[model samples]
Target chain A: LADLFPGFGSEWINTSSGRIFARVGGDGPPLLLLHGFPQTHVMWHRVAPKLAERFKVIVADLPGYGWSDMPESDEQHTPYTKRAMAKQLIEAMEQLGHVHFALAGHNRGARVSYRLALDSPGRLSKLAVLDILPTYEYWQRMNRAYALKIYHWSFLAQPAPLPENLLGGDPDFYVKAKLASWTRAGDLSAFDPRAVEHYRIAFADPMRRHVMCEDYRAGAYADFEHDKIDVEAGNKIPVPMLALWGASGIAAATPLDVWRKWASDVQGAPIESGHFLPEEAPDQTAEALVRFFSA
Target chain B: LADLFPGFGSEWINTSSGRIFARVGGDGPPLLLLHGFPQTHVMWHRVAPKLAERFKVIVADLPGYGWSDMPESDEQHTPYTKRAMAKQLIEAMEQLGHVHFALAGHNRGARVSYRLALDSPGRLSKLAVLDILPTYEYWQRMNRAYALKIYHWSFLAQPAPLPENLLGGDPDFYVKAKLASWTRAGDLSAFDPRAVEHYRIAFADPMRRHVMCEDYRAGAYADFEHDKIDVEAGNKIPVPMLALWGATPLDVWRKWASDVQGAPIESGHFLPEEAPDQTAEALVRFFS
Candidate 1:
């Protein structure tokens, strides 16, 4: 796994919330790189090194996800809540002697970055979320086509034990199917084989399967509640935001209009790929990230 | 398969559009029963025998499905359309010497029954649609929860070879998963083990896979367009209509049909299979 990001040493940073599995290296402004679901920090292997030349990139797995400490589901999925996960990353960043950093979270991680941006209130210098709309925006504007294309948002969010029991039959197949389905051509050709192994092995862990379901349940349940509450409080994102989507992915809806509703300053455009923006179009994703954050 | 519905003789009814496979039995007012996707005529085994006691039950497979001549896709899926399938059933009924018959269609079958009621006026006693909303209403009011639960409606409706390729693998797994997921409790306990096999046989065939996709593609596209046109023409079901739902919103049908009678049936999406007694009761009372 460390080999995916050469010269980036793997580390376990202890935080108040839990121990975080992270890869820390590069030099310049600290940039915290967060990955989405069913993947690890390795998702940014293609783009992180490129960004490393311009910034100190800290790519880490969210709690209860790849190479990270699996937190048991506290009531209302508190352990898996983005607020909780954000705190872990925050404490880890503090331990690394970096208080504020530019943030780029992809998919699930972008969700956490979104929550962190709201909860921390001025901690992040700039924010960019890949191939996603805000959690509340999704709940507000969900349609039949969007729902059907991303049924996992519903399937995985089903109350625990159900998703766990069904996914238990074959985690390998489930992980691979999701990876393939979210791609442009509906196949695995876009992913690096070694990176695929990292994902497949992590999802194979039965605890992670249940853990991840709880995390998703939190997404639809408690996490969505937090976002709605933030919106109700008139909390627009205080930082400049970049929202990138896949031209052919489930995020095909007009994401900028959705993002603009939540943030004061928002800029978004579609990337010519599927949902996995970093791995699928690392060059474009990194270019956008560098340009947005450098300003 | 014939053993499932005893005293019902199987016959291959030839029609202008295509050949329709049907199980005909009993003697009284003719009653046509149409089956839905991922299942054959055998889906009505539990509900048919009881309906047969009072009325003649003609449980037939839709065109391109189950012992029927599966037509290759025509342009815009004209060959596999509900409008086209309704015509085949219409011709088959005429051949059976029943100019007008009481019609009941379940799911996809319900869709064809719906179109048949509108297109072929003065041809039915009453129309009872099982566990379905009209094609236009579905597209018009589709939301995330509905979309997530019935994701396959969109997935299967994808253009030829996309759905065909994805569902081609391990047909057993695909069919069983859909059956289990679409039920009330999200499992297969409601289905008869024997009836399940009949569905498996039809869905397992690669040709049937492509045919079924075309059938759904028609549902999402052409069928929807026709329904919208009928609505614009201000057409309504002239005959008595029965709309049933499985614990969903009960009266969405009121928008299209003027004299609509609908109530929530005590079952899930698969009302006939899930609550056979309740399903039969509704059918007998509505058609009686």
Candidate 2:
């Protein structure tokens, strides 16, 4: 993993809430990257090293994901909520000697970034997320296409062990299938073989799979509640927000209309890729991010 | 069936959609009774016999169900669409020497009845559906509780032979599980053993098992499309509508119909089998 990206320093930061494993490298204005489900910060392998040329990059495994220590989930799934996760990432960044920085996330991490942007107000200089609708909008507008494509969101969100047991049946097949189905190109080839191994090893762990369901169980139960409260209270993202989705993604809904419902400043365009925008189409993802972050 | 119903006569009638197997008896105003999934016309065994004493009671199987013909379905699952099945039921009632009749159905049968009441407004004088919301409402408001309880709606609605193969692995256990789980008491003992045998023999058929998939697959695809089209066109159930549930349903049907009123029947998904007395009385109160 160290050899995958040269000149990157690896470090563990102990936070009040949890431990974070970050791949730290480069020098410039600080920037942080968070990765989503069924993968680790390993997802940024294609784009992070390049971003390092212009910005100091810190990519950390989300708590309960990859090598990061998973805290136990409460009844409402609060420990795994994006708010809790956002706090962990913010603390990790603070420990890395940065107070405020540019932030970007993919999939689940993007959710945390958005939630963090709302909770902390001016804590982030800029925020961007890929391949997601706001949780409130996603739940409110779920349809047959969304239901069929992302069946696991609901499957994993159910009460513990129902999904945990089913996913644990064979995490190898489970992780491979998610990758094959969700990628722009339908194979493991789009993912570097090493990254795939990193994902498989982390996912195949029973403890991770158990906590993975709790993470979603939190999203469906607690996180959804938090998102609703935010919407009801008319809370909005306090920073410039960029949203990018794959043109040929599993679902099609105008993101601008959706984000405008939740945030005050939202601008984005499609990546002409699939769900793994950064991996499948790194140059476009990077170009878009660099242009916007420097904007 | 005659032995079970005493005076009722059983017959196979050829309708435009397909030949239907039904048992008919009673006298006076006509009332057509339809049964829902994983069972047959036999689902009304407890309710229909009593209703027959007042109205000309015709308890019949939905097409591609029971001993009825199992037809091939299209990509949109047209053969099993409630519109097509509704036509078969309407024609079955018309051929029974009646025009306007009070109608009632349970579960899948209720879906057909609701569609029939919308399409052929002149054919039905009143409508009653048991233990189900409109297919459109169910899809629109689907959640964890609905999905978990009715997981088969999606499982069975998927493209052919997936559910067929899974269900065929053990139809006996599968059917028993549905009955046991969906009941208020979560037990199969509420069922008359003979009727259970009827459901078993019908479901045990590999052909019927495959056809059942088309039935729900049609509900998810074609039936949903028709319901949406109707809503878009601002068409509602033309006849008085009776909505009954086994304590839980989406509760949005009243929006789909101008004249609709019903309450929980103190049972589960199999409302008739679980609460035959209330099920029969609800039919009588609404239809009469």
Candidate 3:
């Protein structure tokens, strides 16, 4: 993991959700990278260095994920909500001497990024979300095609021990299947073996596996309600938001149109890749990020 | 099982789906009783004897459930669909020398009962479904509350081996949880220990677990589509339809059929087990 990030230094910082694990490197303006579900900060190995060349990069695992602390979940899944995660990430960034930074997140992390942009107000210079719609919009548009595409949303959100036991049956198979299915190429060819191993090991832990379900439980309830409230209040992302999605990704319909409903300044295009843009199409992904954040 | 059924005779009969296990007893007007998911013909123990006083009761386990053969599933889940299960049940009844019979099914069996009435045309003298809306209506009405109430419709329908492995972890816990949760008592008090044991043992089998998933998969896809097509074409249940539901059941069969009438049975989702007397009285009144 160290070799992949070149000169990046790892640190553990205390935050609200729990102690977060971060990999910091490079120089210039601070740029924070948040990784998604079933993976970690390791997902940015291919793209972090490129961005690091122009900016101070901080790639941190969201709480209850990767090397981060797995906090206890409340009835409402408060600890796992995007609002809670984004607040914790903001605290981590401020602790690192950057009160404001450019942010890019993928999948679950993307969800956090948008919430931060909406809730934190001026904490982010720019926001870039990869391969997702706002939680509220996504649920509203759920049809058979989209539902089957992401059955885990419903499956994982089920009351605990049910999903925990099911996913625990074979963590390796579950992790690999999830990662491979979202890619345009229906295999693990896109992910680095070392990174996949890291993901598998973390998922194999019983606590981590249970936390993952809590994460979705929050998504289905608290996170969803938060997004719904914002949408109802007609609140928009105050920051300049860049939306990037794969031509063949999990965003069931055009993501740009959906994001536009919730953002004032939104611009992005489809990358010739799958869900894991930073790993599957790193050069193009990094170029887009560098250009958007630099501007 | 035999002691519970007393004079009832148990038999295994071959059908399109597979070999079916049945409990046949009494003599009068022929009436076939179908059990729902995660239970067997034993679910009707209390209700069956009362109905048998005036009706020849033919209580058969649906294919892939109970002592019946667990059939292989296909991508389309055709074999597990109500169309398939209903056809096999009709065949099982015919083999017992009844070409026409009044039909009553609970939950999944209700699904099969309606399909039997629709597809078999003249074979059923009356159709009674216990505690469910048609598959199409149920899916169409899916919301946060309803979806949570029946999460298994989506959870169990997930492509197997996933559900099978999850459920296989502790089949007893799974069976008891399912049975207890749907009752008015919110406990296993309504269920006989013998009947609950029968259900648990059947569910614990690897193949039976997979078959349960297949049954739900059929509901989500094939059965859902079949009902949708029927509703679209304005087709209705030809026989006199009687829909009896628990006080807390998902129901609306009248919308699907013009010849339908229904009432609440003062219980929860498991009307047969939770309130057997009310369930039996309603069946007798409607069937007679």
Candidate 4:
């Protein structure tokens, strides 16, 4: 697998928000990859090399997750909205002299990519969103099954302090326990122990855990409210769009016809894989991304 | 305009292709459009109302040009490709359960629906198209400037039955004149009026003009060979598509993205004022 994807490394940076950590190594065009909850940029350690040959890959941990700084202010910190995070990531990339890049995200990262497209249109030549829908659509289509599959959406979206208190008891226990349960039976063994330990360190801090809860809570309310404004104002990403989903994943069940009504040009397909496509199915994901971006 | 769109009250069927041609008055779906040239299923007009309304609409002229049949023979009767002569207007819709409908068109039928679509996609899912880009993309994309225009394609694709020889001593000067000078003007009106007159009436001449040398030749060689295969394989028309153009049109461009890459759609946008409601409804209704 390592031979398949070469020249990948990890690095960190200090930002106004916090000390952000990222996996930095690759060649060709720059690609900013983001990971979902309970996972670090290391989630992409296995996938980056496949894309690295043709892209300068930058996979980063969200501020409160992984090796990034755990801001002491959970209540004071602006919740981690996709737009806000995307802005910070853009700033981080600019600081590194990487202007003009394409973005691909899985799970939470996919959510951020959507916001990136909406927030910074000219910066991205193309946008690929994996395994998620526009937040507004997700909220509108929520159901019993969805509520169950993504239970944390409701659990983490609750107003902080209380939820923070429970998890603060032992951040490591909560992180490890959640990671073990969140993944499928065989997935845990398949993941790299070092990467898992890195994730454990990020979530071990109480303040960081609090920030994660607040970030999700923001999504349920303020984040959605903000998205509505953008959608109505026709704040569209004029660039081309590529949307792919795991055929057996949650996104495959949602209606995405609305995307066409919004995007100027769009294309989508379903890949046969689970949620962690970039890692579990790097070949498929990389090939699709390269073809979509080139096209 | 009245002579071309002869709505609702008209009915005719073609036995050769087993298609029907009929028009009905209604307040429901806004369009019942048709395509010209070596075409079947009315080309651009067939998918206009799938999402336009619950019902209430129009569909016909799937036969030969208007409401009838063509004599079948070896060379005299050419199978309708996307470039076949217009046939009956009703039998085709009967297959799909459509009776009455609003109507529109481009090229052969902008010549047809110079007036149609209801209030918008809101009222009568109007259908309209302009200086068609379907076959042109295959021919024009390779060249630059004057050489890229449709007339150039027509000149090269003309069938063996030479226009000059068929026209005799005077060589159908009027028809020849129009075909040769049609694309000269930067705009539609720039062409000679006499040429337009001969070209329009020539549709009635089965052996000589119904096949419209340029249209058939292009369909057989250019459109079918290149465009049709693409449309059939996966050109998912999820909804009615509308293409519109102005009278003084410069060029029509085909979308490079896969037609059904994300959604199903069909389109033709030509001559807006002539088919105002249909043109407007095409966009309004499709999005709605």
Off by over 4 Å in 4: A1-10, A72-79, A169-190, A252-258, B1-288
TM-score of predicted chain B versus true chain B for each candidate: 0.96, 0.95, 0.96, 0.34
lDDT of 3 by residue, A34-94 (tens): 9988898899999998999999999998988988998888899988899999898888887
The best candidate in terms of lDDT = 3
Candidate 1: which pairs clash?
B105-B110
Off by over 4 Å in 1: A15-19, A37-39, A69-81, A148-152, A155-217, A244-254, A265-284, B16-18, B74-78, B158-193, B200-213, B247-250, B273-278
TM-score of candidate 1 relative to the true fold = 0.84
Off by over 4 Å in 3: A1-3, B1-3, B248-251
Best by TM-score: 3
Each prediction's DockQ against the real complex: 0.19, 0.12, 0.41, 0.00
Q: Looking at candidate 4, what is the lDDT of residue B220?
A: 33
Better of 1 and 2 by DockQ: 1
Query: CA lDDT of B24 in candidate 4?
Result: 41
Candidate 4 TM-score over all chains jointly: 0.47
* Tens digit of per-residue lDDT, candidate 4, span B1-288: 123232334555434465455454445444465544322222323233332344334444433443435333234234333323322233344454544443445554432332122111222223344555455343433221222123223332333443322333232343434333333332344323442443344443545343345444534353344454544553322224345553312223224221211111232222232343544454445434
Model 3 interface DockQ? 0.41
Best by DockQ: 3
| Residue runs of model 2 more than 4 Å from their true location after superposition | A1-30, A92-99, A121-123, A142-155, A159-189, A193-210, A250-267, A291-295, B1-33, B37-70, B88-102, B120-126, B137-217, B232-241, B247-264, B285-288
